[PDB]
Structure 1
């Protein structure tokens, strides 16, 4: 029996909520460390087994003792409560850097020399290509184009939406080149640079991934992983998502890195040329390649994103002829990594009105609003106020949640101002930081119940009780898709289908594209912005 709360903290100007399992209202108090009450109220029912207490009106920063029944919790209120965790979430990307020295003065215990420095062989050939840099994808050391595109897009969108919040954090600054770009762009450039090396100069197509044939032991340090690197074949999905990300990067970097901006624009155009001359073939692992497939049978949303990205990059109305029929399809409007249509919708909506059809544009805005309404109804039913149903708690459920919060916030940039947007964002953070049935903070290195045993090779290699901080784990997954989950979590409700165990890859791994929406959402919460 405990209090469930945001274990990282609460914003002075933000909503403040705790949860408890109870069957009737109870008085609660918030007190100073000496013990004197500064706030008091009554809990109220929200369904399932749950009651909530609202202490939003407490505006004075500090560490308070929350008392309800015979239970106590320590809660922090601060002007920028999430600054440290946002910084850690962004530093994760630098911790994932491949082929670059990470010095101890930046990386502490996890400092290491440049890893995976060898040339990658193109599958089914004797040709070798240098594809250095960028990020290890997850708990493994593969670098995969499709999910990379999402992580880049999310960081770029965070820079575009919340630059002031991001300005207050510091990545591994000394590992990046001077002059230093704004934090999100400094970090994202490393991945963008690597992506550019994955494009085949002859055809404009993009290799699906570069990995070793198989996964090394969970125990393996990055610099000790010396198996041969293989470039898996060019794929439609990789080429299209590369196109979209590069087109996005072209726009965003224009005033910061003109050479990169220009390089990305032309790379995007060459990638789109490839799309036009090739079939929408889903990617499957070649024989002898057992690493992450990142497959996907539906590719029209990738074409949609690429098309809309180039529409916005160029501002040329000719692109709307291709975009608008794709926007009419009943594709899910989601934020990846496989279902990427909402990135395209956003690029379309963020293009000057003059370049697109007014009729189509209003239909797209209207669909977006209806989608958000649906998510808002979900959140209203849920005891923790998050836009989730039991069946949404799948592999990477934390990302499912964060993408949904992100959609609310993105919409505010294109004239769709849903009244639940900022409540949803706060509840998503609350949930991520311990306001859930397990009382689990789903980020390593933070909260009172942090993640301690992530499925992450650098963490497992160094200290299995003390992992790299700032890593957002996948979260509860009702499908029990690893040995540990099957054995330990059968019969538990959806939100309880998580275990902090290094072998539980289906509930407790990490990913660049799980940190990326988290950076966006937490940055939004820091940029406190009503009248």
Structure 2
């Protein structure tokens, strides 16, 4: 497959521009207008392994150019807002996943419905029932889970706070949101917050782990065709803590837009934390008779960290610094979910007014955060595609691992922790996700020259349209070959090549709400840069 590897979505006018080829020496290259006029030229340079890169960043005039190097040819496009449409489709994906709510045909097209899982969820072990209407279907399945929901919400909320201008005029589905009509990111994220609120037991303040069917309906199964009884898995520490942090964050962001919802989230967060103080950290386990997504976790101190730090920033009360800061000194991995969420708390802590926290602890936190970014930067400098990844990092949901890492750079920039490689990593992450990889694969449905055509997504599989729901970020290459398709097809291939666009490859070609949400953040960042 001797080919030119590039960002198949496009390049920003004022953005960094790079293409990849396999070679053993530098080669001259050139870009020409559609009419054949040479407008740019340069030399490729080695970046490790068999890989060479070409840099045409200085080419600022928008349009479609013919890139030539050696005998190889490719067409790249430069646009003022090249990632405008893909960002829109990425946020619109959340509306496509909406549950218990009719999606109008004029907006949802061939994947329209219809109200799925309207059944009042029976609490596990009992006959009492609460109405738990979504909200979003988590992944390719239709299950709704509290823990990963908190990440998806937090990311979209963070995307709004950081890059409101880039998201200001993206349009979610028209007839599914209420008043006051919020900025698109907040307009979309509110739906998941609303469902999450109904997941909190008013009796104990605790939060149910997941409301799903007992088992997984077939890949072919339509949402409404899935009418199995809805189980309500027990309250868990992880569910309550992540709920608490997400609500405290929601209560803070939505205040100048929806004061009514802001008030409701704040009270829900406090009650949720009250539960944490009276219950031990117990790892969730699937109830007997439940085989849906467990989303378990044995380490729960980072959840408490996030919950504490979120309430710290929500209240601005230095009383929270007493519980936050000891947890911040722990050697927990500072990551962005869904299981390891410590960095979310770190950010809330750093975005808290300096007068409410300890200076020496704040300096230590900033110092560690920079070290972590330094390590990622070193990884990106060694990687041929400039992304903060090693071979053993390419596991289940490697694209989220990548995107979370790019997000960490951009988040830290917002709190005065500026690493010089931050915006380079952001572009490289987008390049990789949009085709700049050993497979030349655009890992987003409905975009690029080699798009994802057969994702592990039941609404997409159900419809016989031979093209899935657009704007879905798939899991990406997984070296552990954790499905029957991958183990047969992808055996022997390098980590970055451990992907296949097969609808039955759920460990490489699955989608998720918490996979699109960091994608929204990173892509919005690139558009905001202008």
Q: TM-score, normalised by structure 2?
A: 0.99
Are the aligned partners of 1:474 and 1:509 in contact in 2 as well (CA < 8 Å)?
yes
Deviation (angstroms), 1:49: 1.1
Deviation (angstroms), 1:24: 1.1
Are the aligned partners of 2:32 and 2:65 in contact in 1 as well (CA < 8 Å)?
yes
Distance 1:325 1:44 in 2: 47
User: Aligned residues, how many?
Assistant: 529
Distance 1:227 1:468 in 2: 24
Are the aligned partners of 2:155 and 2:517 in contact in 1 as well (CA < 8 Å)?
yes
Distance 1:468 1:307 in 2: 38
Query: Which sits farther off after the overlay, 40-49 or 295-304?
Result: 40-49
Deviation beyond 4 Å, 4+ runs, structure 1? none
Distance 1:30 1:124 in 2: 66
Q: 1:181 aligns to what SS in structure 2?
A: coil
Are the aligned partners of 2:473 and 2:515 in contact in 1 as well (CA < 8 Å)?
yes
Deviation (angstroms), 1:115: 0.9
User: Is it true that 1:244 corresponds to 2:250 in the alignment?
Assistant: no
What residue is the counterpart of 1:206 in the other structure?
207
Instruction: Pick closer, same or farther for the CA change 1:280–1:86 going to 2, 3 Å.
Output: same
Are the aligned partners of 1:304 and 1:327 in contact in 2 as well (CA < 8 Å)?
yes
Are the aligned partners of 1:83 and 1:168 in contact in 2 as well (CA < 8 Å)?
no
Deviation (angstroms), 1:178: 3.2
Deviation (angstroms), 1:48: 1.3
Are the aligned partners of 1:137 and 1:512 in contact in 2 as well (CA < 8 Å)?
yes
Are the aligned partners of 1:173 and 1:180 in contact in 2 as well (CA < 8 Å)?
no
Deviations 1:170-210 (CA, angstroms, capped at 9, x unpaired): 11132111332100000000000000000001000000000
Are the aligned partners of 2:180 and 2:258 in contact in 1 as well (CA < 8 Å)?
no
Deviations 1:20-42 (CA, angstroms, capped at 9, x unpaired): 01111111111111122111111
Q: 1:506 aligns to what SS in structure 2?
A: coil
Distance 2:15 2:287 in 1: 50
What residue is the counterpart of 1:103 in the other structure?
104
What residue is the counterpart of 1:294 in the other structure?
295
What residue is the counterpart of 1:188 in the other structure?
189
Deviation (angstroms), 1:508: 0.2
Distance 1:5 1:487 in 2: 28
Deviation (angstroms), 1:228: 0.3
Deviation (angstroms), 1:268: 0.3
Q: 2:64 aligns to what SS in structure 1?
A: strand
Deviation (angstroms), 1:223: 1.1
Are the aligned partners of 2:134 and 2:144 in contact in 1 as well (CA < 8 Å)?
no
User: Is it true that 1:527 corresponds to 2:528 in the alignment?
Assistant: yes
Distance 1:353 1:229 in 2: 46
Deviations 1:61-117 (CA, angstroms, capped at 9, x unpaired): 001111111111111101100000000000000000001110011111111111111
Are the aligned partners of 1:213 and 1:228 in contact in 2 as well (CA < 8 Å)?
yes
Distance 2:59 2:453 in 1: 32
Structure 1 gap ranges (5+):
none
Deviation (angstroms), 1:54: 0.2
Deviation (angstroms), 1:463: 3.0
Structure 2 gap ranges (5+):
none
Deviation (angstroms), 1:464: 6.6
Distance 2:225 2:486 in 1: 29
Are the aligned partners of 2:457 and 2:503 in contact in 1 as well (CA < 8 Å)?
yes
Distance 2:66 2:13 in 1: 16
Query: Which sits farther off after the overlay, 3-12 or 20-29?
Result: 20-29
Distance 1:284 1:63 in 2: 53
The 5-angstrom pairing of residues 127-526 of structure 1 reads 127-463=128-464, 465-526=466-527
Q: 2:508 aligns to what SS in structure 1?
A: helix
Q: 1:377 aligns to what SS in structure 2?
A: helix
Query: Which sits farther off after the overlay, 171-180 or 509-518?
Result: 171-180
Deviation (angstroms), 1:303: 0.2
Distance 1:176 1:101 in 2: 12
